Amino acid sequence: PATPITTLQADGTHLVDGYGRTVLLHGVNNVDKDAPYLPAGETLTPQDIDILVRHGFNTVRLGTSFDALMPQRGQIDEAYLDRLTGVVDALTARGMHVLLDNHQDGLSKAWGGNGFPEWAIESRPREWEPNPGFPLYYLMPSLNAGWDEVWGNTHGALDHLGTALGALAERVEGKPGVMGIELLNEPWPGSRFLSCFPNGCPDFDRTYQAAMQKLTDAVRAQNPTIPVYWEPNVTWNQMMPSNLFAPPVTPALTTADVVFAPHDYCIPSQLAIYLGLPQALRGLCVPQQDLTWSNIDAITERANVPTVITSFGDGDPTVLKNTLARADERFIGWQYWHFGAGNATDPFLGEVGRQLVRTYPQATAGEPGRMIFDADNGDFAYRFTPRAATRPTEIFVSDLHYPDGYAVQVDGGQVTSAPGARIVTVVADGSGPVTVKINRPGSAGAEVPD
Ligand code: NA
Numbered sequence: 221p222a223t224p225i226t227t228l229q230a231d232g233t234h235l236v237d238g239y240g241r242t243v244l245l246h247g248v249n250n251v252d253k254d255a256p257y258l259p260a261g262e263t264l265t266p267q268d269i270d271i272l273v274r275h276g277f278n279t280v281r282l283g284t285s286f287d288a289l290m291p292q293r294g295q296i297d298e299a300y301l302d303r304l305t306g307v308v309d310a311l312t313a314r315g316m317h318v319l320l321d322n323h324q325d326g327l328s329k330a331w332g333g334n335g336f337p338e339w340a341i342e343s344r345p346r347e348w349e350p351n352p353g354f355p356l357y358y359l360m361p362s363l364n365a366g367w368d369e370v371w372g373n374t375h376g377a378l379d380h381l382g383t384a385l386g387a388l389a390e391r392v393e394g395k396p397g398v399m400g401i402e403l404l405n406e407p408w409p410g411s412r413f414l415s416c417f418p419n420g421c422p423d424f425d426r427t428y429q430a431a432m433q434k435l436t437d438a439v440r441a442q443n444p445t446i447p448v449y450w451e452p453n454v455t456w457n458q459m460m461p462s463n464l465f466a467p468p469v470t471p472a473l474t475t476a477d478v479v480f481a482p483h484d485y486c487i488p489s490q491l492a493i494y495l496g497l498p499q500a501l502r503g504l505c506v507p508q509q510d511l512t513w514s515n516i517d518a519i520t521e522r523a524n525v526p527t528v529i530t531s532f533g534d535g536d537p538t539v540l541k542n543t544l545a546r547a548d549e550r551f552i553g554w555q556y557w558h559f560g561a562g563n564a565t566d567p568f569l570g571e572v573g574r575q576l577v578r579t580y581p582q583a584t585a586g587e588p589g590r591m592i593f594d595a596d597n598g599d600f601a602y603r604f605t606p607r608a609a610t611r612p613t614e615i616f617v618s619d620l621h622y623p624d625g626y627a628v629q630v631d632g633g634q635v636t637s638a639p640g641a642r643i644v645t646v647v648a649d650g651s652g653p654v655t656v657k658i659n660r661p662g663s664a665g666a667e668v669p670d
Contacts, residue, residue: 223583223611225315225397230447230477232524235365235553238396240609241583245399245553246576247316247533250561251283251323253334255291264561269314271566272559275577276616276642279317279399281530281555283322285336296387302658305391309588310615311398314653317391319449319555320398321530322385323405326357327366331414333357337406341366341375355494367410371427378431384440389443390626399448402481402530403435405646406454416455422470425442429470436475442515449481449530452519457485459508461515465523473523482518483531484512484546484554486539493534502538509542516550518630529554537571544575544595549669579618580660582643586611589653590669598622601659606648612636615644615656629665 226238231547235243248652252258264280288300311318324335330344332353343366345351350360357363382625385401392398409427415421436448439591452462465473465481486509488501516527532543533556547554559567578593579600589603598621602615613633617626619642628635630646632654637645647656659665 221314225305225311225312225317225616227396227445228317228399228447230479230526231645233526235479235526237583239583239611239615240607241611242588243317243553243583244551244581244588245267245317245320245528245555246578246580247277247278247281247555247556248280249281249283249321249555249618252288253285253323253325255287257300258307262561263303263307264310266310268559268561268563269310269316271563271568272316273314273566274583274619275573276580276618278315278582278616279319279553279555280311280559281319281402282311283321283323285322285335286340286381286384287329287459289388290380291337291656293339294380294383296384296602301387301391304388308392308395308398312395317399318400319400319528319530320388320392321402322381322407324663325354325406327363327370327408331360331363332367333359336366336370336377340375340380341369343369344373355490357573364411364413367408371410371431378434382435382535383418383433386438386554387478389439390448393443393446396644398446398450400477400479401440402449402451403432404451405485406450406457407451413455416453416460417458418460420461420463422463422466423578425453425466426470429464433475436478438473440464445477447477447479447531448475449479449528451481451483451530456512457483458487461509462519464519465525473525475546477584478525480515480516480525480527481530482512482527484509484529484543485532485534486536486542489539492532493536499508505539505542509539509546513546513550516552520550522630524621527552529555531555533557533572535572537575540572541595544578548591548593551591562585574620577615577618577620579621581613581615583611583614585611585613585648586654592666592669594666595621597663598635598658599663601655601666601668603653603668604656605653613646613654613656615646615658617642617644617658625661626658627661
């Protein structure tokens with residue numbers, strides 16, 4: 221008898237469910253970048269969804285796009301919206317919190333990318349201008365001129381995008397499992413991007429923040445309560461800090477339920493995948509990714525809003541621990557790139573899945589304390605401080621790490637679930653801290669960090 225899914229509400233840095241519990245989201249991306257969008261029989265199947273549930277994932281970052289929503293000037297595609305809501309409903313029915321990702325790469329299909337419809341952008345690449353494809357096409361002069369049209373609202377591109385996202389927001393209004401709308405994937409600053417280096421671009425971030433606020437206000441005009449997810453400008457991915465929410469340079473947030481949505485990629489990993497550069501350069505992933513996490517801490521400290529890592533990984537098993545361990549340190553959730561529809565085999569049964577599939581507290585009837593998971597042998601420890609909630613703490617137990625079953629110990633509380641349950645339920649004895657250990661029966665287990 222599964223716990224009915226609820227809306228999530230940001231309370232400082234916490235996402236809190238309808239039962240008063242603090243939620244940790246671990247899941248995947250599923251994004252359709254080419255017309256026709258979400259066509260019959262090419263979306264996530266019940267077998268796909270069974271795979272996600274089996275491995276205890278509780279979120280999907282589901283792609284949409286301006287092009288999908290408004291493929292002709294001023295004309296919402298209501299049929300596309302039917303198809304999208306069908307996928308959303310399928311996911312939320314199985315306990316997945318769905319984040320609607322307004323996706324783009326390279327601005328538009330004019331450049332071989334996706335996201336903004338071609339009718340909305342005037343700029344076009346010339347026949348003689350080199351196009352290196354993703355990701356280096358962000359250096360093309362015509363693609364930069366396109367971005368300038370966006371941030372200058374030269375031809376009303378953001379006004380139309382506001383209409384599109386407003387229509388989406390209206391369509392999903394009232395659905396508790398919709399965790400929000402992510403306003404724009406990887407926003408690129410355009411022609412003056414060199415102002416972001418080597419230490420960020422406060423003036424651009426003022427422009428960007430105002431655009432995100434305008435979009436947020438348009439969304440909220442049609443759906444007053446839906447959470448909105450704001451990415452940093454994408455020079456973030458080249459180690460640059462964000463200047464969002466940094467008065468007096470940029471405004472303090474005065475809008476409820478805004479969540480920070482950064483990505484966490486290793487540059488040399490991505491360069492090896494897309495350019496064929498030496499894989500051994502990934503020697504630098506650890507220190508470079510540590511820089512990203514430090515940039516996240518700065519936002520957390522200054523703005524006091526939640527963070528979800530909305531994209532990371534991209535098939536490289538060597539880099540995952542850098543995200544996973546640092547996210548666990550901060551009790552921050554995440555969505556892995558990428559999970560395709562129509563899987564003929566479970567793609568989580570190898571090295572990537574060994575790390576992504578974890579024992580973890582999906583919802584805590586308390587304030588989270590420190591947590592560790594050992595992805596080699598399944599050792600798990602977690603401490604938290606109880607607060608009153610209307611449901612118990614629920615901890616998903618990896619279906620991969622315990623081939624002879626699992627043992628659970630709780631200090632300061634009790635296990636109320638059956639032996640071998642997929643979900644461990646824990647009720648606190650009192651006001652004092654609760655410590656949960658889960659491990660293989662013969663293991664001495666993990667210790668709570670610090
Ligand atoms: Na498609």
